[PDB]
Design a protein around this ligand. Sequence first.
Ligand SMILES: O=C1Nc2ccc(S(=O)(=O)O)cc2/C1=C1/Nc2ccccc2C1=O
Ligand SMILES: O=C1Nc2ccc(S(=O)(=O)O)cc2/C1=C1/Nc2ccccc2C1=O
Ligand SMILES: *Cc1c(COP(=O)(O)O)cnc(C)c1O
Ligand SMILES: *Cc1c(COP(=O)(O)O)cnc(C)c1O
Lengths: 809, 809
Amino acid sequence: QISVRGLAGVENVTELKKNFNRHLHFTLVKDRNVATPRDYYFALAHTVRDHLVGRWIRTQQHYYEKDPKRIYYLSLEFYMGRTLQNTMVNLALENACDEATYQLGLDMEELEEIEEDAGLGNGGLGRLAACFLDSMATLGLAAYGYGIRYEFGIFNQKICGGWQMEEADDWLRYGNPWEKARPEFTLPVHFYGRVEHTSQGAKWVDTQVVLAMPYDTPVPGYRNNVVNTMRLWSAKAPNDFGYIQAVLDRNLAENISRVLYPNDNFFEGKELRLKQEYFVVAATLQDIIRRFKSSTNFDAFPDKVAIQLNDTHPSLAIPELMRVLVDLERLDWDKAWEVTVKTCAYTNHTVLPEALERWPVHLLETLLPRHLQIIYEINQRFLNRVAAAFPGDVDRLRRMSLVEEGAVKRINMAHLCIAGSHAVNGVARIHSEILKKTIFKDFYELEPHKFQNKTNGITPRRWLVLCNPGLAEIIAERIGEEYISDLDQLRKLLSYVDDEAFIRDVAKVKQENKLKFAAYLEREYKVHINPNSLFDVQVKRIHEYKRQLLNCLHVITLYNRIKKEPNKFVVPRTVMIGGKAAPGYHMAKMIIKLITAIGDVVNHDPVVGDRLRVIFLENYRVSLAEKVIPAADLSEQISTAGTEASGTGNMKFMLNGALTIGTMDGANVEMAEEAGEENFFIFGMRVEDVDRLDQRGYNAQEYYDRIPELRQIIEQLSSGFFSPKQPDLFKDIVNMLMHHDRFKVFADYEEYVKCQERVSALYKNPREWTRMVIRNIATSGKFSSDRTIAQYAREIWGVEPSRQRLPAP
Amino acid sequence: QISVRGLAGVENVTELKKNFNRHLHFTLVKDRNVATPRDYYFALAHTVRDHLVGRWIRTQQHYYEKDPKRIYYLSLEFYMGRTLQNTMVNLALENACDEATYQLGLDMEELEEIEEDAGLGNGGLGRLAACFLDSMATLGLAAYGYGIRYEFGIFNQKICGGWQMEEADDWLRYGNPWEKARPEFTLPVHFYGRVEHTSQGAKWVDTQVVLAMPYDTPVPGYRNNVVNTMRLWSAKAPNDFGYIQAVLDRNLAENISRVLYPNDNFFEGKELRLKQEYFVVAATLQDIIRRFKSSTNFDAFPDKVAIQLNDTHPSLAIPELMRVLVDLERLDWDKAWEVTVKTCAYTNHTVLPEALERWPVHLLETLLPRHLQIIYEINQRFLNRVAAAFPGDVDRLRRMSLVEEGAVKRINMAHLCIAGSHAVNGVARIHSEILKKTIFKDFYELEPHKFQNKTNGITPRRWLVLCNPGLAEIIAERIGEEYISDLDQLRKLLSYVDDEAFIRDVAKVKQENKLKFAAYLEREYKVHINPNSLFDVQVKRIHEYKRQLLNCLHVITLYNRIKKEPNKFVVPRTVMIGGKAAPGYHMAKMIIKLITAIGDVVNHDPVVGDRLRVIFLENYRVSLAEKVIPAADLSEQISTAGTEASGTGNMKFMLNGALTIGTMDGANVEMAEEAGEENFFIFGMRVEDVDRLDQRGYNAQEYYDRIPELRQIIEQLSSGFFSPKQPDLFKDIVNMLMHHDRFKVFADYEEYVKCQERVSALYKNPREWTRMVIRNIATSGKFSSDRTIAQYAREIWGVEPSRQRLPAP
Ligand SMILES: O=C1Nc2ccc(S(=O)(=O)O)cc2/C1=C1/Nc2ccccc2C1=O
Ligand SMILES: O=C1Nc2ccc(S(=O)(=O)O)cc2/C1=C1/Nc2ccccc2C1=O
Ligand SMILES: *Cc1c(COP(=O)(O)O)cnc(C)c1O
Ligand SMILES: *Cc1c(COP(=O)(O)O)cnc(C)c1O
């Protein structure tokens, strides 16, 4: 059908059809008479999977032959989403398969919707890991993703009575055709026990043993025949351990890989979480060292191994590597430490204090007694370095300590990571500067060479070609297909900004995507959106710092203005807000309810009509993002300046033809800088303004007293206008906004609504709104994760990316 | 190589080799460079499995077309063992595969030893279910095996310090290539709740829901292209149900199918067991009725459905069927009851009181409140029948009640089964008579037409062709291959009893099997048996009624006679005793220790030499039975007359060339009757003698006082002769034998040793021992499970067996 989807050869289609029938029969043990749509999806999934194996086997064999430096990306989260379509895209099998299934009388798109999302992530952090894997395979890096195989991923969100309800995400229920169990590579992981000091070294004894069984999932590069591996560990009880009760208690050791903690940017200090963190680290390092010993002086270890810590979650890799090198391999401390620092790199994702991992000492003490001793030794030698560099600065010593004194002693994992890594990076220019100027200023002054920046990116394969083929096609029609793996080329589209044919095409694609989504909204969930309105969307995890509340205030404002002047013309808008709240995050759950409560009033007001609709997108996840984003006109990125480290959803929207309304926060700053401030809807306080407000003190009352419209909104909320049967349902929200708003929603209210008026004004001029859209898409090249990864490879890992096709399949 | 293994066609071998390589590559994602023996076994298993699917699909389609009467065999146990070789044998693929793997440079036998046993059974009861499935497929019956998919089967036994140690049987660890998950057929099962009586009928509400997910395993008939199905249910928690804790508590509902209770002939009244029993029944009946409604007056139900209860474990099927018919389908009681009785049949397996299921009322009351009401109603109407038939016999009423009064009210499941079934059968002639004359005499007098006999059998495919190809070949050389599915033909071998060539062949096969096992004993476990000695073996579960202790006394006697007269000639014997003890069966565990303690003395006595060896076969299971049995010379079947309902190991030994020493118990009686008493080593009390001893009272002291040799043995045990460091280690054993021996070991001691002397005497005459062996093998035809199943089909289920090949694959 469309160019970018590959050729549908005569031989290829014929071969696909027979292998499809082969799997339906031999693999699924079914025949055309009793097969259900799910059986067809599996037949197709196995057929596509067959095309990967050859490449997967020789890619791994290749690395064994040439023995290049290996990159190990440790993360407790990999937000993969679906993999069928992505695999077809990267293998150029999409049209062949579409055609082959067509001839077999099946709609391929209908079959793809059957695939369960691999939601092993919460949000930004987890998705970045996923985009990174794709880019590393595309750039020919010998990389491995390591994590935990949760049998229950992020919970599926249900809205009942306007409230969020959580239900287990049993994504493995029907099976996963992409993973390959490797029980022959099972490794033992130790917990508890105690430390014995013998003649020659310390020993960790009397430990509880849990087995780590690996599951490999192929990660195909874009049309280069490279297939890397994502290895996910599963917890298994040793056969060692009433008889019946003993057998049933095995489900105590295996609970370690049972479920993903659903916290986005929040630290919950539960023991089960620490176990997961150590579990993934202990098993991974053994696998790493084993693979290394094959390639025993570890001086070359850093030249053959790079370990990237995606946040502090896998920070125990630092003391664990030291433990193995010192306790088992018997290297002297200093040598081991040099080695550790040279192979580890740490990526910071947020500056919010409630997100920082600070593990109580009594916990590490009981669970990992040997690691605690190593941590104290590391801390001891590190503070000696600080004291020698800043004699007499005793306060600096307690501020930089890995050990935090107070109510209960805690270990600051972020300080541990900085000390044991040769590189520390932020995820956006502004975020990285903030790290050097505030949160980690003492560390920066001590070792300025460690601090770097690596602005985040998204993969153009899943985030353009896969979810927006229509847009990918009209672009390719003009500049070719080369941009798919070199997004910078999108700049060439800048010379089509005045091209009347292109203007019409870009706008036509957006309209088709909106009709497509508007339909999906009725087919599933039976809604009533009007395709002609401006699609105003904000999708991301529910957070006070993300300020979904600032969006709500604008929605209520728009509503009150319509009711005030009913017969005045206003640009039609469908505001869509979606996202999950962490189960124990009360304020976030109240916000979801407020959103649906506003929709209950606004959507049933006869005077409003189809001029304003408020929809809450249920169960926002990766596969839902692939549908909404391509259909969006306005992208809401309105976090308080200085809180959103980078953000990545913002990039997805810019690449798919939506204009952006936001604050100068995270990557928003670099995006506006690339597209030009005139092509961006910027508003609100900058980082400096927030600081000046804090010096003086933030008093929400002041804004409530001076802005009539804001006052009316707060009064409607307190009087029960949006909750008739429950007059004070939103007392917590009002109370928070008025007395303890850490994110100063009111401070940005006035500039936000005025900026929204500028958006409605531009929308009334179709031609100009589209030319601005083109200006955005054309300058989004910098935000490709290929660029991000190439910088990591060159400035942190010491490896050169390659675009060379691997010697065929 | 050998005839009975099929042809190794040129096309066939070539096709097998390429599909093998296809699976190693595409399925296992490996190449010849990194594949391990386990990968080769899986490649082969998938290759063989591919040959079943075609047949499996059309066999099920066939039944759907013709719609014959369906047989449902409900059992909580299916002792399958390995399935690779059995599948090749039934598909005539054994030589083709042996050859194909040979050309690929692999030893097929080495690969088969890698397969994990499917030990979803304890012993006799579970193995019978397995043999039955094989015979039903071979006789072309539309049969389905229904049970539970335990993720942990019978425990693996380890001997430490002479003691049994149990360790989880994680048989699914590396995966099971034979099963096919059918998550699309998941059914809900209800527990707890309460009963509401509404205008029109009773309702069971507020129940806890557990999901039943089925896994299908193919059951191939012998060379007839029929492939039936064994459906095993797995417990899954509904997605309905702190957030983390809620997700982790799902492993409370799924524990139902976690592990098999390891009790052989013993009732343990734990709630988890009752749950398993209801779980398998509730899910199965829904599947049965659903399949029936397709083929709504249930008058035809009995003509389309037969449900066989393998013991009382699935007895809840009776009140559950009534519940569905009355509460859901709304049929009147009497109609529903007629239907139930006509479709259900019950098989009794033992008369030992400690084995009888008597569920406390308070348990059924809480877990299955509605079933309790149905049971009381059934009981009420049944006792009304008894009273009308025996007016005034009030004692008969309390003896026949399904409800048992006393300390705690209990429900007698055996009485429930007899009342709700149209047929009740024993498993051996003597056992069935005992049921009518004692244990169920009142029921027999009330409905004599319900009581039948169906002597057990073993499948000649797994128990001859598979484990003893050498013997199968020399037999076929003389009478053809027809006997494999018509064992009666073995009688033709009676005319070769004087044939010098056959005598030599039969004896040669036994010798090769012994060398083969003697090697296996050293290769694994490093032992030291002498292939020239008489192989005296007793393998079965450890039980006081099986009397492994009577065997021990003989062993100690033989030892004491050698020490008394060292330079006297005695026939060399290697006595092998093996079997598992239930974890909580203290006496059984003490017996295992006694056995190894005797071996520790006997095996290291210089004066004994290689004249007497005592070995304890570790982890006796189905695959180990396939090795020992073919190598045995003497089969020990020495249970106290009246305790072993039938036994099946006895039949396996008779078919493989071992002579039998035993009591007139169970099927031993029919075996001696078939071979002729002169060709059997019978000894001990008969059932009548045991009763006369009980009338008078059994006083072990009397035997201890009158038999010098027995006295010496008991004194060696009490003085610590066999336990030096622990003088009184065996005080429980001695105490039991002397004061509370329910199985009167001493009463049979004298006749047992004298009979053992007759065995040694015959062994010294190779030619005559072998001619007697031939007489046994030639008359073992009656004990084929094909005969047993044909009788079940004709006299209980109302279906005709067929030997017609199904229309090719
Ligand atoms: O994200 C989260 N997950 C959980 C889980 C459980 C709790 S609990 O209240 O401590 O039980 C709290 C939280 C939680 C939270 N997230 C936030 C974000 C900003 C301010 C306060 C909290 C908070 O308590
Ligand atoms: O086979 C078995 N399994 C178990 C499991 C647990 C127990 S417990 O002693 O009640 O804990 C007892 C048993 C048990 C038993 N089997 C037998 C057979 C003959 C006489 C007494 C017992 C006995 O207690
Ligand atoms: C990209 C993405 C995110 C991150 O969005 P932000 O707006 O940066 O917080 C979260 N969830 C999903 C499913 C995404 O695809
Ligand atoms: C046949 C068999 C049994 C039954 O043996 P009996 O001597 O009748 O008790 C038990 N276990 C296994 C593994 C068997 O194959």
